[PDB]
Design a protein around this motif. Structure first.
Motif, PDB file in Angstrom:
ATOM      1  N   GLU A   9       0.824  -1.203   0.000  1.00  0.00           N
ATOM      2  CA  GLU A   9       0.000   0.000   0.000  1.00  0.00           C
ATOM      3  C   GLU A   9       0.859   1.254   0.000  1.00  0.00           C
ATOM      4  O   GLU A   9       0.553   2.226  -0.701  1.00  0.00           O
ATOM      5  N   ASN A  10       1.940   1.256   0.782  1.00  0.00           N
ATOM      6  CA  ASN A  10       2.817   2.419   0.825  1.00  0.00           C
ATOM      7  C   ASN A  10       3.428   2.702  -0.539  1.00  0.00           C
ATOM      8  O   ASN A  10       3.491   3.859  -0.971  1.00  0.00           O
ATOM      9  N   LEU A  11       3.883   1.661  -1.235  1.00  0.00           N
ATOM     10  CA  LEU A  11       4.541   1.861  -2.517  1.00  0.00           C
ATOM     11  C   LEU A  11       3.560   2.205  -3.626  1.00  0.00           C
ATOM     12  O   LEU A  11       3.970   2.778  -4.640  1.00  0.00           O
ATOM     13  N   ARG A  12       2.283   1.872  -3.462  1.00  0.00           N
ATOM     14  CA  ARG A  12       1.311   2.155  -4.506  1.00  0.00           C
ATOM     15  C   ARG A  12       1.222   3.654  -4.751  1.00  0.00           C
ATOM     16  O   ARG A  12       1.278   4.459  -3.818  1.00  0.00           O
ATOM     17  N   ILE A  13       1.084   4.029  -6.019  1.00  0.00           N
ATOM     18  CA  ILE A  13       0.921   5.430  -6.387  1.00  0.00           C
ATOM     19  C   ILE A  13      -0.515   5.838  -6.091  1.00  0.00           C
ATOM     20  O   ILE A  13      -1.463   5.273  -6.644  1.00  0.00           O
ATOM     21  N   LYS A  14      -0.674   6.834  -5.221  1.00  0.00           N
ATOM     22  CA  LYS A  14      -1.991   7.207  -4.724  1.00  0.00           C
ATOM     23  C   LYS A  14      -2.784   8.013  -5.748  1.00  0.00           C
ATOM     24  O   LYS A  14      -4.003   7.851  -5.855  1.00  0.00           O
ATOM     25  N   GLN A  26       4.141  17.418  10.151  1.00  0.00           N
ATOM     26  CA  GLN A  26       2.869  17.672   9.488  1.00  0.00           C
ATOM     27  C   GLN A  26       3.052  18.585   8.281  1.00  0.00           C
ATOM     28  O   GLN A  26       2.334  18.440   7.285  1.00  0.00           O
ATOM     29  N   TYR A  27       3.994  19.519   8.356  1.00  0.00           N
ATOM     30  CA  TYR A  27       4.244  20.419   7.236  1.00  0.00           C
ATOM     31  C   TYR A  27       4.649  19.634   5.995  1.00  0.00           C
ATOM     32  O   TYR A  27       4.145  19.883   4.896  1.00  0.00           O
ATOM     33  N   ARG A  28       5.553  18.666   6.158  1.00  0.00           N
ATOM     34  CA  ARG A  28       6.023  17.893   5.013  1.00  0.00           C
ATOM     35  C   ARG A  28       4.898  17.059   4.412  1.00  0.00           C
ATOM     36  O   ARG A  28       4.818  16.914   3.187  1.00  0.00           O
ATOM     37  N   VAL A  29       4.027  16.500   5.250  1.00  0.00           N
ATOM     38  CA  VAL A  29       2.876  15.768   4.733  1.00  0.00           C
ATOM     39  C   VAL A  29       2.002  16.685   3.893  1.00  0.00           C
ATOM     40  O   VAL A  29       1.549  16.314   2.804  1.00  0.00           O
ATOM     41  N   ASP A  30       1.748  17.899   4.383  1.00  0.00           N
ATOM     42  CA  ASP A  30       0.916  18.838   3.646  1.00  0.00           C
ATOM     43  C   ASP A  30       1.557  19.200   2.317  1.00  0.00           C
ATOM     44  O   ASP A  30       0.879  19.270   1.286  1.00  0.00           O
ATOM     45  N   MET A  31       2.871  19.434   2.321  1.00  0.00           N
ATOM     46  CA  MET A  31       3.560  19.836   1.093  1.00  0.00           C
ATOM     47  C   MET A  31       3.442  18.765   0.032  1.00  0.00           C
ATOM     48  O   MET A  31       3.284  19.060  -1.154  1.00  0.00           O
ATOM     49  N   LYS A  32       3.548  17.486   0.433  1.00  0.00           N
ATOM     50  CA  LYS A  32       3.449  16.390  -0.521  1.00  0.00           C
ATOM     51  C   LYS A  32       2.085  16.324  -1.186  1.00  0.00           C
ATOM     52  O   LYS A  32       1.976  15.788  -2.293  1.00  0.00           O
ATOM     53  N   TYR A  77       0.918  19.682  -4.702  1.00  0.00           N
ATOM     54  CA  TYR A  77       0.978  19.491  -6.142  1.00  0.00           C
ATOM     55  C   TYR A  77       0.152  18.305  -6.612  1.00  0.00           C
ATOM     56  O   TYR A  77      -0.042  18.147  -7.821  1.00  0.00           O
ATOM     57  N   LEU A  78      -0.342  17.478  -5.693  1.00  0.00           N
ATOM     58  CA  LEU A  78      -1.072  16.266  -6.032  1.00  0.00           C
ATOM     59  C   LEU A  78      -2.580  16.415  -5.914  1.00  0.00           C
ATOM     60  O   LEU A  78      -3.312  15.885  -6.753  1.00  0.00           O
ATOM     61  N   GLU A  79      -3.065  17.119  -4.897  1.00  0.00           N
ATOM     62  CA  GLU A  79      -4.493  17.182  -4.617  1.00  0.00           C
ATOM     63  C   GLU A  79      -5.020  18.576  -4.329  1.00  0.00           C
ATOM     64  O   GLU A  79      -6.223  18.802  -4.507  1.00  0.00           O
ATOM     65  N   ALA A  80      -4.184  19.503  -3.902  1.00  0.00           N
ATOM     66  CA  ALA A  80      -4.672  20.792  -3.437  1.00  0.00           C
ATOM     67  C   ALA A  80      -5.291  21.579  -4.587  1.00  0.00           C
ATOM     68  O   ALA A  80      -4.635  21.787  -5.612  1.00  0.00           O
ATOM     69  N   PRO A  81      -6.543  22.032  -4.462  1.00  0.00           N
ATOM     70  CA  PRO A  81      -7.110  22.893  -5.509  1.00  0.00           C
ATOM     71  C   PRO A  81      -6.433  24.243  -5.613  1.00  0.00           C
ATOM     72  O   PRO A  81      -6.599  24.922  -6.633  1.00  0.00           O
ATOM     73  N   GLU A  82      -5.675  24.653  -4.598  1.00  0.00           N
ATOM     74  CA  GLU A  82      -4.931  25.901  -4.692  1.00  0.00           C
ATOM     75  C   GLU A  82      -3.904  25.855  -5.810  1.00  0.00           C
ATOM     76  O   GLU A  82      -3.579  26.892  -6.399  1.00  0.00           O
ATOM     77  N   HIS A  83      -3.380  24.672  -6.116  1.00  0.00           N
ATOM     78  CA  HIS A  83      -2.418  24.518  -7.197  1.00  0.00           C
ATOM     79  C   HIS A  83      -3.150  24.592  -8.528  1.00  0.00           C
ATOM     80  O   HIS A  83      -4.044  23.785  -8.800  1.00  0.00           O
TER      81      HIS A  83
END
Ligand SMILES: CCCCCCCCCCCCCCCCCC(=O)OC[C@H](COP(=O)([O-])OCC(O)COP(=O)([O-])OC[C@@H](COC(=O)CCCCCCCCCCCCCCCCC)OC(=O)CCCCCCCCCCCCCCCCC)OC(=O)CCCCCCCCCCCCCCCCC
Ligand SMILES: CCCCCCCCCCCCCCCCCC(=O)OC[C@H](COP(=O)([O-])OCC(O)COP(=O)([O-])OC[C@@H](COC(=O)CCCCCCCCCCCCCCCCC)OC(=O)CCCCCCCCCCCCCCCCC)OC(=O)CCCCCCCCCCCCCCCCC
Ligand SMILES: CCCCCCCCCCCCCCCCCC(=O)OC[C@H](COP(=O)([O-])OCC(O)COP(=O)([O-])OC[C@@H](COC(=O)CCCCCCCCCCCCCCCCC)OC(=O)CCCCCCCCCCCCCCCCC)OC(=O)CCCCCCCCCCCCCCCCC
Ligand SMILES: CCCCCCCCCCCCCCCCCC(=O)OC[C@H](COP(=O)([O-])OCC(O)COP(=O)([O-])OC[C@@H](COC(=O)CCCCCCCCCCCCCCCCC)OC(=O)CCCCCCCCCCCCCCCCC)OC(=O)CCCCCCCCCCCCCCCCC
Ligand SMILES: CCCCCCCCCCCCCCCCCC(=O)OC[C@H](COP(=O)([O-])OCC(O)COP(=O)([O-])OC[C@@H](COC(=O)CCCCCCCCCCCCCCCCC)OC(=O)CCCCCCCCCCCCCCCCC)OC(=O)CCCCCCCCCCCCCCCCC
Ligand code: HEA
Ligand code: HEA
Ligand SMILES: [O-][O-]
Ligand SMILES: [Cu+2]
Ligand SMILES: [K+]
Ligand SMILES: [Zn+2]
Ligand SMILES: [Zn+2]
Lengths: 47, 99, 121, 107, 90, 49, 65, 459, 61, 180, 91
Positions: free
Chosen positions: E76-81, F23-29, F32-38
């Motif tokens: 699960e960790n390696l899967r691309i989300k 928590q900051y690093r989790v948010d940053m990740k 670019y992937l999900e945030a509508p602000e981007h």
């Protein structure tokens, strides 16, 4: 991008390059060590 | 209350300090020597014995981190999933574009 | 524990109270503090305790406030800042009831942990 | 590291059962700004200042010896305020050793 | 001696420490050689240290890796989300 | 021995910023992937005035 | 002599003339003026005013005063 | 006499007196800067007179460093107590001591006269070329002042070194502090003189060192080879004072005297080899950057040992002694404040962090916390300790808790916000700025006016 | 500043988040500008917005 | 009690601002004519003639103090023979009330106590080791991060476009490759 | 303000004749400094500064109300879109 009012922005803000992210995280990485150095020393400033 | 006094008396007995292992080369007090100094001497700080210090300091450490957990699980909340990122129309012109 | 386990040649007081005494004091007046814990006019020497009679190394502790106000005074008779209170009364109590000391310290640390974590998070 | 002078138990034995620690006050007294008399001129005010030096004060013990005002550094040994010429006679730093020579003794 | 309380060096190695002046000189020389060696043996060596197929994997690496492998967490960790930019608007 | 209390107090306060950084690093990740602000294909050149 | 024992004996014995203190303060005051006077002079030289009016180098509302 | 006096103690008083006088001009310039920066717009300097602001910041820096703090901590307290601490009758070189203070005054008069007579332009206190060499005659005058100041500094350093030949007692930590600063001056000043002469050659002798095919980065190397040793020449005397005050007032013998001494020696050697942490953004080679970053972080080790040795001096001291004396409060405040300045120094020492924080007000706040707060307070604390020996009066400072509290609070109001705007970011050496940085700049400005008001209450 | 806006939302969702910029004025001239306006900018801005709406409809086509 | 009231009498409030009459009412600048006060002004301050114009260090009023036998006057001690022994009685300074004013009574007690020294050599040595090597560890903990981030800035990257930026007084020139 | 006489944990040790010497009091007196109005003003003063130090004065808010309502309208109508709780903040 641009400064905004009454912002601490401790360590930097709004990176737009991988290097910019690196800079912010380098500061964040050392910040807790700085707090430890301060707190641990100041706590003993007393008679 | 009976259990309270029981554990209080159990802790107390175990913590009673033993004589220190002096890390300094001092003489033995002559035998039969009582109080020679007075209370106007510069105050010497009252220090807890090692066992008692560990017990209370450990209770403090167990307290702060259990308090951190209480705040994290009850007072604070987890991030809900980010809102869906739908395609949106950008502004037609930059407000500063010459006409 | 200096008097208890380390040094047997200093006078050892009796704890009058494990809590400070609150008193109003006036600048320009001299106060005498009981260092034996047996005075009946706490926190002051009553003229009949060990301190007043200069018995067993006990002497009254001279004190004078700089300004008028309400000041806390030592009841445990061992505070480092005696006659004034600095928290040594609680510390000496923990030595005498280590189980109780842990309860208070845990509670204080628990509150401090919750508040600091709640605000920063 | 320095931890005080070494004591042998024999030296802690009293010659009387009532001996306690001498309660001599080492507070020199109550002081404030040195207060000059108006009548005194410059010369006589200088004498007044020289007679108010704390570093010339001491405490006399029960056996007649006096413990002087002492300081870690010689800055506190000159008159206050500092005179133009302070250490005319060289201050002597006394070192101690166990060496001895026969000429100093007589049988 | 590196990261060594010299009180211990004086106690356990009395004969090696008898001449304290010489002992001080060795302290300087040993740490001088350590600093010099680091530059020319750890930093300088050219075209070395690029074997990324030989990344050290410690015993703790494997303990944690096997634990997650046993469960589905490693997969699960390696899967691309997410591999799309925009969600579909209903 | 007291100085240890300062070490522990400085380790607790430091750990608070570690958690914020974590928590900051989790948010940053997720930006670019999900945030509508981007937003992409959004900024247009202004042009010379 | 007793008068010569202490350096600056008159001041230390509290007999000095107050003018010495006044000169010291005046000297400090003059030193401070070396930062203010050239500021005023330079402002007038390049603008015609000794000091600006806050935000007079920017666009101001009609009722601004 | 007044000007002819050779008494080493009188000359020490002269150094403190002149530092306060010149200091008035320094503080006034600081007030101008903070007033201007209160909002965005022009407040007290016209847009056509922006060159004056550049001159204000340049003179502020130069005067406070070379004409105020250095003459106060390396000329004032040293000339008064060092010969006493050394149990010697007087200073080794009497006539040289007299000329040194006269030289300082004469160089000050030249500088301020150049304000009045020359066109007012600025190039920073670091006088970077080519900007410094394309300016007007005011730059020439400032160069003469620095060279003249250099003469006084070196001869005073020679004077203190000669105490080793005559000292009749033990070299106390404070004496070690001055001796090492003297060594740092003897080794750093000759390099500064050379590079300053090259600035003059390009200004006045048609030299071409700082034009194309000549490397302008050369100046920065030679300047900062003196620059950083200068910041430790300014702090080490302060450390020496702190040691005496803590030991005396707490009635406690210095702990780890030899480690204190060897920490001062270590800081000097290291401080002589780390200068290029001021040149991180020029584009130096990767290995050079790594060397300098590595050695810069090492300086914390000896500096840290001294801090902890001071703490144990205050720990355990008798409670009966009154602890509200201004000298004791200032000495304690120095430890609390210096740690802040040093830690921020370690942050900026990381070059990648430095890319973001170079030429920003974070650097300002960093060196203000150490100098404008730490060094000033150390000089005040030292003078206060010697109030009886010096003999000054007509001030209410010795026991003034209001002054200490107000100073500490307001000084932090000025420079703590300057750390924030460093990540905003607000560049240094500017007067106009974006409207979204007003809040923090305004708060610091309110702090500056308040601190000045507190300076009047001492009288 | 899209990352400042994203990080503010994330922090606020987790716990108590307070911004000085939200409560306090950002400039000191606020005490005098309660009723101040730039009417020339108002007319120009309104005209540009009207033109933008026409361009948007054309772009939609 | 109020100790100021004890010596209130000695402190008579003053009449003149800065303690001197106008020079017209009394000329304090002139040298005093009183015998034995030729080196002082009327107000008691040293005269400029004594200290500046005719300073003895400059060769004025040459008067060698030492006599023919190389001796100078020296005041002897207060000697008191007693019990078959010659004793010297030391000079005790006057009461601090005379010099300072406050009455020397009700003085707080500050007992004699030998210096407050840190003990337990073994423990102290370990602390000093930690005072040095705990910072050393922290520095070593930053060293590896510092190297990595430095290496990252100086990485040979496959750049595909170049923008040249020249800084002039006071504007920034930009040179960019034009599309073909 | 005629404070009360707190006997304490051991009332027998406060049963003597105090005479001129002050008698022990409740701890509320220490916090209020015997209900000294100036200390209450000073206490309120301490809170006022600390609020300025951390969050700003918040005494300008009544004056800034109209100009904070204009800033909020501009951010909503013309500013970049805010999502969720982000819409609470205006800069
Ligand atoms: C479950 C509960 C378990 C409880 C276990 C209790 C054990 C215990 O306390 O044993 C004491 C016990 C003594 O019992 P006692 O009857 O009171 O006897 C005392 C005697 O008088 C004489 O005894 P002695 O002569 O044998 O000597 C004993 C004394 C000798 O003491 C000393 O010599 C001093 C020791 C401390 C020195 C520390 C130095 C630090 C220096 C720092 C320098 C750097 C600072 C700057 C850093 C800057 C960085 C940037 O020891 C102590 O005082 C020890 C104090 C505790 C030290 C703890 C060190 C680690 C930190 C732990 C914190 C608490 C954690 C709780 C966790 C709970 C769970 C979450 O010892 C033994 O039985 C054998 C020893
Ligand atoms: C259960 C209660 C505790 C709950 C929480 C526990 C959490 C776990 C801790 C570890 C386990 C604890 C176990 C203790 C058990 C008891 C053991 C024992 O022996 O008991 C008797 C023993 C006392 O017995 P005793 O000696 O016989 O006499 C009784 C007296 O009460 C004598 O008492 P004392 O002398 O020991 O009194 C304690 C006092 C002793 O210490 C002091 O009083 C020292 C105060 C010195 C202050 C100097 C002025 C500082 C102003 C700086 C302003 C800077 C502005 C500009 C900044 C610019 C930045 C860019 O401690 C303090 O005041 C705390 C000082 C802490 C450090 C202060 C600095 C914090 C910095 C934060 C980060 C800043 C970052 C930015 C700056 C730059 C960073 C690079 O009790 C204790 O040891 C009590 C310790 C209590 C510690 C409380 C700490 C609270 C404050 C936290 C930090 C502030 C922020 C918080 C959010
Ligand atoms: C940072 C600040 C805050 C600091 C706070 C913290 C402080 C902590 C404590 C620090 C303590 C440090 C150690 C202190 C040791 C003191 C030892 C001592 O007292 O030594 C004795 C020493 C001398 O006493 P003495 O032994 O009796 O001496 C007898 C004389 O030798 C012989 O007596 P005489 O009467 O024969 O004297 C000769 C006299 C003869 O005098 C007269 O005849 C005077 C006649 C009246 C003249 C008055 C001035 C007139 C000005 C007119 C201006 C007109 C402007 C018109 C503008 C029109 C515009 C349209 O003078 C002269 O002939 C030459 C005077 C030269 C000096 C004055 C220069 C003034 C400025 C000139 C500027 C020129 C610019 C030209 C530019 C050209 C450009 C082309 O005392 C002093 O010199 C006074 C010191 C006073 C302060 C001591 C410290 C107190 C504590 C600190 C207080 C706070 C101070 C803050 C700084 C100042 C702020 C402003
Ligand atoms: C056709 C032509 C052919 C070719 C011809 C070629 C010819 C070639 C000629 C070559 C030689 C020319 C030069 C000859 C020099 C002779 C020296 C000599 O042997 O004198 C013996 C002579 C001995 O005198 P005396 O005849 O025995 O009697 C003297 C009196 O009785 C008085 O007795 P005293 O000495 O005890 O009293 C002195 C003292 C008396 O004290 C007082 O007045 C009161 C106490 C002090 C008040 C507080 C002052 C502030 C605190 C200062 C702290 C640091 C002091 C450092 C030590 C003093 C340094 C000056 O006051 C003063 O006079 C000066 C006090 C300090 C003034 C500066 C303070 C800072 C002000 C800052 C303001 C701006 C910011 O020396 C003096 O007493 C006077 C020397 C004057 C030298 C002046 C040099 C000034 C240079 C300024 C800068 C120049 C460039 C820019 C100028 C711009 C102008 C617009
Ligand atoms: C805003 C309006 C004004 C508010 C004023 C607040 C002042 C707070 C700081 C006071 C000084 C603190 C200090 O270092 O006291 C030394 C003092 C040592 O002896 P002292 O002779 O009483 O103090 C002499 C000082 O110079 C005392 O300084 P002083 O010479 O200026 O005399 C003032 C005197 C009288 O001042 C007062 O009556 C202050 C009353 C404050 C009430 C605040 C109400 C709310 C205001 C908002 O202060 C005291 O008696 C010190 C009381 C310290 C505790 C305050 C209450 C804390 C909460 C319980 O330490 C203490 O008594 C406090 C130690 C507390 C435990 C610390 C470790 C705990 C760790 C576990 C948690
Ligand atoms: C006396 C003044 C003084 C002092 C002591 C220092 C001390 C230090 N300074 Fe300096 N500095 C200046 C004055 C000073 N500085 C000035 C004036 C400038 C700007 C000049 C200009 O650019 O015009 C400057 C600029 C400056 C820069 C330039 C940043 C930039 O240009 O962008 C840097 C970065 O390397 C730096 C670093 C340091 C370091 C690493 C220390 C160290 O000495 C700090 C050491 C102290 C500590 C580290 C805290 C105490 C130690 C401990 C608590 C031990 C535990 C800590 C650790 C283990 C880390 N300084
Ligand atoms: C030690 C030197 C020193 C001191 C004390 C100060 C003190 C102050 N400085 Fe400092 N400052 C510098 C050295 C110093 N500064 C340098 C080197 C620069 C960079 C120059 C450049 O950019 O080119 C600089 C830059 C600088 C700037 C940047 C302007 C810019 O370039 O954009 C600003 C304003 O923000 C400022 C403000 C202040 C303030 C408000 C004070 C103080 O007023 C704060 C309040 C404190 C006091 C008022 C007490 C001071 C008292 C004395 C100094 C006298 C002591 C004498 C005795 C004790 C005998 N300084
Ligand atoms: O400069 O550090
Ligand atoms: Cu540097
Ligand atoms: K401005
Ligand atoms: Zn009693
Ligand atoms: Zn108590």
């Amino acid at each position: 991008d641009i400064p905004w009012p009454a912002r601490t922005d401790w360590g930097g803000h709004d990176p737009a390059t991988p290097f910019a992210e690196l800079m912010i995280n380098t500061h964040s990485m050392f910040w807790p060590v700085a707090i430890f150095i301060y707190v641990s020393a100041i706590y003993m400033v007393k008679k | 209350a009976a259990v309270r006094s029981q554990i209080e008396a159990a802790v107390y007995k175990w913590t009673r300090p033993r004589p220190p292992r002096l890390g300094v080369a001092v003489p033995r007090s002559p035998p039969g020597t009582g109080i020679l100094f007075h209370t106007n001497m510069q105050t010497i700080r009252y220090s807890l014995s090692p066992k008692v210090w560990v017990l209370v300091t450990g209770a403090a450490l167990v307290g702060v981190f259990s308090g951190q957990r209480f705040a994290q699980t009850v007072l604070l909340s987890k991030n809900p999933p980010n809102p869906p990122r739908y395609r949106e129309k950008p502004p037609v012109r930059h407000p500063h574009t010459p006409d | 524990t200096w008097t208890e386990i380390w040094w047997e040649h200093d006078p050892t007081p009796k704890v009058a109270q494990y809590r400070p005494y609150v008193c109003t004091v006036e600048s320009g007046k001299v106060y005498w503090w009981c260092a034996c814990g047996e005075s009946k006019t706490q926190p002051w020497v009553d003229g009949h305790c060990k301190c007043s009679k200069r018995e067993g190394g006990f002497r009254p502790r001279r004190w004078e406030p700089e300004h008028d106000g309400v000041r806390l005074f030592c009841g445990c008779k061992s505070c480092f800042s005696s006659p004034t209170w600095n928290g040594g009364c609680f510390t000496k109590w923990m030595q005498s009831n280590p189980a109780g000391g842990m309860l208070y310290c845990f509670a204080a640390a628990f509150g401090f942990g919750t508040l600091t974590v709640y605000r920063k998070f | 590291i320095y931890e005080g002078q070494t004591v042998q138990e024999s030296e802690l034995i009293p010659q009387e059962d009532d001996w306690v620690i001498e309660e001599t006050n080492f507070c020199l007294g109550r002081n404030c700004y040195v207060r000059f008399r108006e009548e005194d001129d410059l010369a006589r005010r200088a004498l007044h200042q020289m007679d108010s030096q704390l570093n010339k004060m001491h405490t006399r013990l029960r056996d007649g010896t006096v413990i002087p005002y002492m300081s870690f550094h010689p800055d506190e040994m000159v008159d206050r305020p500092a005179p133009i010429h302070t250490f005319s006679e060289k201050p002597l730093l006394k070192w101690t050793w166990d060496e001895t020579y026969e000429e100093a003794y007589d049988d | 001696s590196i990261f060594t309380p010299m009180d211990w060096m004086f106690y356990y190695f009395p004969n090696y420490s008898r001449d304290k002046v010489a002992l001080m000189a060795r302290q300087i020389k040993i740490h001088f050689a350590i600093g010099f060696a680091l530059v020319f043996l750890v930093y300088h060596p050219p075209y070395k240290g690029a074997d990324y197929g030989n990344f050290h994997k410690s015993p703790l690496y494997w303990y944690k890796y096997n634990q997650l492998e046993r469960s589905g967490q490693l997969q699960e960790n390696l899967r691309i989300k997410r591999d799309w930019f925009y969600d579909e608007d209903p | 021995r007291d100085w240890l209390i300062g070490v522990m107090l400085g380790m607790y306060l430091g750990n608070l910023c570690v958690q914020q950084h974590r928590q900051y690093r989790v948010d940053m990740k997720l930006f670019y992937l999900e945030a509508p602000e981007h937003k992409i294909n959004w900024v247009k050149p202004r042009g010379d005035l | 002599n007793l008068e010569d024992h202490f350096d600056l004996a008159e001041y230390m014995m509290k007999m000095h003339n107050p003018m010495s203190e006044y000169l010291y303060w005046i000297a400090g005051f003059v030193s401070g003026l070396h930062g203010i006077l050239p500021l005023l002079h330079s402002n007038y030289y390049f603008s015609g005013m000794f000091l600006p009016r806050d935000n007079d180098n920017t666009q101001l509302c009609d009722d601004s005063w | 006499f007044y000007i002819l006096v050779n008494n080493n103690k009188r000359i020490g008083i002269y150094y403190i007196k002149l530092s306060i006088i010149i200091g008035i001009l320094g503080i006034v310039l600081s007030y101008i800067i903070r007033v201007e920066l209160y909002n965005s717009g022009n407040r007290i300097i016209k847009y056509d007179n922006v060159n004056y602001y550049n001159m204000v910041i340049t003179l502020h820096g130069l005067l406070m460093i070379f004409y105020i703090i250095m003459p106060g901590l390396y000329g004032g307290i040293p000339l008064y107590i060092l010969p006493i601490l050394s149990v010697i009758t007087d200073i080794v070189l009497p006539r040289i001591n007299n000329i040194s203070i006269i030289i300082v005054l004469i160089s000050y008069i030249v500088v301020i006269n150049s304000i009045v007579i020359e066109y007012n332009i600025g190039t920073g206190w670091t006088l970077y070329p080519p900007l410094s060499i394309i300016g007007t005659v005011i730059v020439n005058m400032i160069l003469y002042g620095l060279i003249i100041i250099g003469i006084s500094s070196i001869i005073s350093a020679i004077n203190f070194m000669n105490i080793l030949i005559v000292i009749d007692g033990i070299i106390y930590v404070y004496i070690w502090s001055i001796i090492i600063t003297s060594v740092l001056l003897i080794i750093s000043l000759p390099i500064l003189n050379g590079i300053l002469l090259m600035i003059l050659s390009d200004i006045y002798f048609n030299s071409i060192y700082f034009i194309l095919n000549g490397d302008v980065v050369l100046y920065q190397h030679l300047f900062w080879y003196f620059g950083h040793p200068e910041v430790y020449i300014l702090i080490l005397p302060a450390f020496g004072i702190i040691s005496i005050i803590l030991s005396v007032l707490n009635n406690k013998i210095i702990f780890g005297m030899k480690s204190m001494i060897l920490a001062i020696i270590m800081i000097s050697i290291l401080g002589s080899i780390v200068w290029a942490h001021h040149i991180y953004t020029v584009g130096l080679e990767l290995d050079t950057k790594i060397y300098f970053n590595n050695l810069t972080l090492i300086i914390s080790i000896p500096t840290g040992n001294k801090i902890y040795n001071w703490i144990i001096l205050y720990i355990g001291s008798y409670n009966i002694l009154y602890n509200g004396y201004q000298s004791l409060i200032f000495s304690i405040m120095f430890i609390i404040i210096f740690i802040i300045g040093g830690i921020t120094g370690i942050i900026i020492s990381i070059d990648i962090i430095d890319i973001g924080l170079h030429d920003t007000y974070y650097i300002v706040s960093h060196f203000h916390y150490i100098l404008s707060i730490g060094a000033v307070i150390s000089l005040l604390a030292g003078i206060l300790l010697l109030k009886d020996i010096i003999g000054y009066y007509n001030v209410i400072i010795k026991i003034n808790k209001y002054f200490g509290l107000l100073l500490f609070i307001n000084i932090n109001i000025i420079f703590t916000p300057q750390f924030i705007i460093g990540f905003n970011v607000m560049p240094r050496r500017i007067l106009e700025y974006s409207d979204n940085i007003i809040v923090w700049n305004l708060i610091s400005s309110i702090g500056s006016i308040s601190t000045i008001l507190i300076l009047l209450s001492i009288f | 500043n899209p990352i400042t806006r994203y990080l503010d939302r994330r922090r606020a969702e987790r716990g108590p988040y307070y911004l000085m910029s939200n409560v306090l004025p950002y400039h000191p001239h606020f005490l005098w500008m309660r009723n101040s306006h730039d009417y020339e900018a108002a007319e120009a801005l309104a005209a540009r917005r009207e033109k933008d709406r026409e361009l948007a409809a054309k772009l939609e086509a | 009690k109020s100790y100021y009231d004890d010596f209130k009498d000695r402190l008579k409030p003053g009449k003149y601002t800065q303690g001197r009459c106008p020079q017209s009412e009394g000329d304090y600048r002139q040298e005093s004519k009183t015998i034995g006060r030729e080196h002082l002004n009327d107000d008691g301050t040293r005269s400029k003639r004594y200290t500046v114009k005719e300073a003895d260090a400059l060769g004025y009023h040459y008067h060698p103090p030492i006599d023919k036998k190389g001796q100078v006057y020296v005041k002897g001690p207060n000697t008191v023979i007693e019990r078959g022994q010659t004793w010297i009685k030391g000079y005790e300074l006057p009461s601090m009330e005379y010099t300072y004013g406050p009455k020397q009574e009700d003085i707080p007690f500050y007992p004699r106590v030998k210096l407050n020294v840190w003990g337990n050599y073994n423990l102290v040595m370990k602390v000093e080791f930690l005072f040095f090597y705990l910072p050393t560890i922290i520095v070593f903990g930053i060293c590896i991060p510092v190297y990595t981030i430095n290496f990252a800035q100086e990485e040979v990257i496959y750049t595909t476009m170049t923008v040249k930026v020249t800084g002039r007084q006071w504007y920034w020139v930009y040179e960019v490759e034009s599309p073909t | 303000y005629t404070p009360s006489f707190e006997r304490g944990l051991n009332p027998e040790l406060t049963s003597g004749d105090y005479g001129d010497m002050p008698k022990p009091q409740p701890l509320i007196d220490f916090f209020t400094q015997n209900r000294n109005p100036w200390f209450g003003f000073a206490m309120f003063c301490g809170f006022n500064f600390l609020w300025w130090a951390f969050f700003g004065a918040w005494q300008i808010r009544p004056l800034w109300a109209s100009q904070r309502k204009s800033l909020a309208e501009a951010d909503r109508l013309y500013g970049p879109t805010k999502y969720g709780v982000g819409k609470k903040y205006i800069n």
